[PDB]
C-alpha cells in the first residue's frame, strides 16, 4: 500500500496528526516576545557605546527565527536564536576593531558579562534554561543592486564572506503567501512542510553512524529546495486536495533543483548569486563532500518510504506506533492524550454519535452513559 492510493479522509487525518505533532515543538508568542525584548535590550545597550566604530549598530533576527520555522531541538532544552548586527560606519572597518568594540561593550554590562561566551564566528549570551542568543558582526556591501541588503559577514578563515539575509526572508515570505488552487466538488503551508521535513530529518539522523550524522542535510538547503519545489507546483496550477499529496509532490520535486556545473554543485540564494549554501558539498577533500551528496538522497528515499510505511498500518495502535517511530514518542503522547480527553468529554457531553455504514464513533445518535461495567 502506497500513501498515494489511500482515500482522502485517511490522508487528511494523517495530515492533521502531523500538524498537531509539529505544534508541540513550535515556540509560543510569549517566549517570542521575551527573546525580542532581550535582543532589543542588547542592541540598545550596544548603540550607547561612545566608540565611533560601534555606533549606529542595529540588531535584527536571522535564520529560522525570521522565517517562522523553529523546531525545538530534541534532547536540548534551549532554542536557538541567531541575529546579526549592522554597523553603517564599518564600511571599511577592520575585523579586530569590530570584535574588540563588541567584546568590551558586552563585557561592560554587569548582567551580560557573566553569561557571555565566545564563538568562532561571533559572540553568544548564555541565557539560562530555554533559549540562546547568537550575534554576527557585519559590514555593508555596495555595488550590487538587488531587492535588499547586500552585505559582508564574518567567517574565521576568510574574515569576510558574502551574505544577504533580508533578501532570502523577503523571497520566502513572498513565496509562502500564495495558496494552491483546491479542487472543487459537485502558519503557512510551506512553513509546516519545512518544519515536518526538519523533524523527520532530526529523527532520522540519530540512528545513523557518525559519518551520516555529521553529513546530514542542513536546514537551509532543505528550505531552499522546498521553496523551489513549491513555486513549481503553484505555477503549474496542479490541484491538490489530499494534504500529504502536497508534501509528497514537493519532496519528489526537491532533488531536481540541485544544479551541477563543471563538477561543482550549486544551490544558490535566488537574490545573491555568490551565496552558495552547498559549499561543503563541492569540497571533496577526504571525500567528505561526496558523502553529503549521498546522505541527502538516502534521506529523501527514507522520507518517501516512511509515509508508505504509515499508510500500510492497520489498527489504531499500529498507526500510533508508526508515528512514534517516525516523529518521536514524546510529541505523539500528547496528541493521543488529548484525543482521549476529547473522547471522554464527548462521552460526558453526549456528542458521541454512531455512523450508519460502519458503526464508527463520531466525536464532536448520542451515546448513553457508562458503556462499561
Amino acid at each position: 500500500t502506497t500513501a498515494r492510493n489511500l482515500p482522502s479522509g485517511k490522508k487528511q487525518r494523517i495530515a492533521d496528526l502531523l500538524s498537531q505533532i509539529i505544534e508541540t515543538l513550535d515556540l509560543t508568542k510569549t517566549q517570542y516576545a521575551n527573546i525580542e525584548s532581550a535582543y532589543n535590550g542588547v542592541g540598545t545597550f550596544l548603540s550607547e557605546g561612545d566608540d565611533p566604530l560601534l555606533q549606529d549598530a542595529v540588531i535584527y533576527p536571522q535564520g529560522s527565527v525570521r522565517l517562522n520555522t523553529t523546531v525545538k531541538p530534541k534532547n536540548e532544552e534551549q532554542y536557538d536564536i541567531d541575529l546579526i548586527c549592522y554597523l553603517p560606519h564599518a564600511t571599511q572597518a577592520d575585523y579586530t576593531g569590530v570584535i574588540s568594540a563588541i567584546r568590551q561593550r558586552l563585557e561592560s554590562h554587569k548582567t551580560y558579562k557573566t553569561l557571555l561566551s565566545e564563538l568562532p564566528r561571533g559572540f553568544r549570551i548564555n541565557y539560562a534554561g530555554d533559549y540562546h542568543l547568537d550575534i554576527t558582526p557585519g559590514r555593508d556591501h555596495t555595488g550590487t543592486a538587488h531587492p535588499g541588503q547586500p552585505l559582508w559577514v564574518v567567517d574565521a578563515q576568510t574574515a569576510w564572506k558574502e551574505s544577504n539575509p533580508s533578501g532570502y526572508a523577503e523571497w520566502f515570505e513572498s513565496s509562502a503567501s500564495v495558496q494552491p488552487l483546491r479542487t472543487i466538488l459537485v502558519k503557512k503551508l510551506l512553513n509546516h512542510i519545512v518544519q515536518i521535513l526538519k523533524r523527520h530529518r532530526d529523527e532520522w539522523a540519530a540512528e545513523q553512524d557518525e559519518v551520516r550524522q555529521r553529513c546530514r542535510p542542513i536546514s537551509v538547503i532543505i528550505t531552499t529546495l522546498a521553496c523551489h519545489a513549491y513555486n513549481h507546483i503553484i505555477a503549474d496550477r496542479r490541484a491538490y486536495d489530499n494534504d500529504l499529496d502536497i508534501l509528497l509532490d514537493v519532496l519528489e520535486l526537491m532533488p531536481d533543483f540541485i544544479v551541477s556545473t563543471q563538477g561543482a554543485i550549486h544551490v544558490n540564494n535566488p537574490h545573491m548569486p555568490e551565496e552558495n549554501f552547498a559549499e561543503k558539498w563541492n569540497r571533496s577533500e577526504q571525500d567528505e563532500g561526496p558523502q553529503r551528496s549521498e546522505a541527502f538522497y538516502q534521506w529523501h528515499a527514507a522520507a518517501q518510504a516512511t509515509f508508505n510505511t504509515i499508510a500500510a498500518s492497520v489498527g489504531e495502535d499500529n498507526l500510533f506506533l508508526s508515528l512514534e517511530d517516525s516523529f518521536g514518542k514524546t510529541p505523539v503522547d500528547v496528541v493521543r492524550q488529548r484525543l482521549m480527553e476529547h473522547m471522554q468529554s464527548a462521552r460526558e457531553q453526549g456528542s458521541l454519535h454512531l455512523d450508519k455504514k460502519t458503526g464508527g464513533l463520531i466525536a464532536t445518535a448520542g451515546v448513553p452513559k457508562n458503556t462499561f461495567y
Binding site: 485517511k10 489504531e316 495502535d317 458521541l352 460502519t358 458503526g359 448513553p368 458503556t371 462499561f372 461495567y373
Partner: protein, 157 residues
C-alpha cells in the same frame, strides 16, 4: 431519566423492526419459535481500526448478550488477561463482552440498559465504544476508560 412506569418490556416483534433500519446487517433471525433475536454484522471502531464481527442475543426476561467472534482476539491478546469479559457463552463461540451495569448494583432499580430501550439504540454503540477502548488498552498497558468498582467481596453474579 424520570419516566412513567406504564412503559413495559416490549415483545420480540417490536424489537425486530429496529435493526433493519440502522446499519448493514448480514442476517436477522428468529429462532427457538420466535423466542430469540440474533444480529450479525461488521463494525469498525475507527478509520484506521480493524474489522470486527459482533453477535447479539436476547430473550424476554433475560438480559441481552454481546459476543464478538472474528477476529479470535486471543491471538491479538497474547494470553495476557483481556479485561471486561463475562463468563463464556457455551452455544455461541467467541469472547463475551460486558457492556452494561446489572440491576443489582443500581440503587434506583433502573438498569443502564432496560427492556424499554430498543436493542439497536445502545447495544451496538456501546459494543463499538467497547472495541475502541480495547485497542487503546494495548500499546499503553492501561485501561484508560470507565473502570469497574474496586469490589471488596461482591461478585456481581
Amino acid at each position: 431519566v424520570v419516566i412513567r412506569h406504564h412503559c413495559k418490556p416490549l415483545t420480540i416483534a417490536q424489537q425486530y423492526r429496529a435493526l433493519k433500519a440502522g446499519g448493514p446487517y448480514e442476517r436477522l433471525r428468529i429462532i427457538h419459535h420466535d423466542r430469540t433475536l440474533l444480529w450479525e454484522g461488521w463494525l469498525q471502531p475507527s478509520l484506521f481500526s480493524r474489522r470486527y464481527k459482533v453477535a447479539v442475543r436476547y430473550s424476554l426476561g433475560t438480559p441481552p448478550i454481546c459476543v464478538v467472534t472474528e477476529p479470535d482476539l486471543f491471538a491479538l491478546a497474547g494470553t495476557r488477561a483481556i479485561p471486561h469479559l463475562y463468563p463464556a457463552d457455551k452455544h455461541i463461540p467467541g469472547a463475551r463482552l460486558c457492556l452494561f451495569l446489572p440491576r443489582s448494583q443500581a440503587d434506583d432499580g433502573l438498569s443502564e440498559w432496560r427492556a424499554q430501550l430498543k436493542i439497536s439504540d445502545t447495544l451496538i454503540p456501546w459494543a463499538s465504544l467497547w472495541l475502541f477502548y480495547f485497542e487503546q488498552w494495548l500499546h499503553t498497558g492501561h485501561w484508560e476508560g470507565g473502570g469497574k468498582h474496586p469490589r471488596p467481596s461482591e461478585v456481581k453474579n
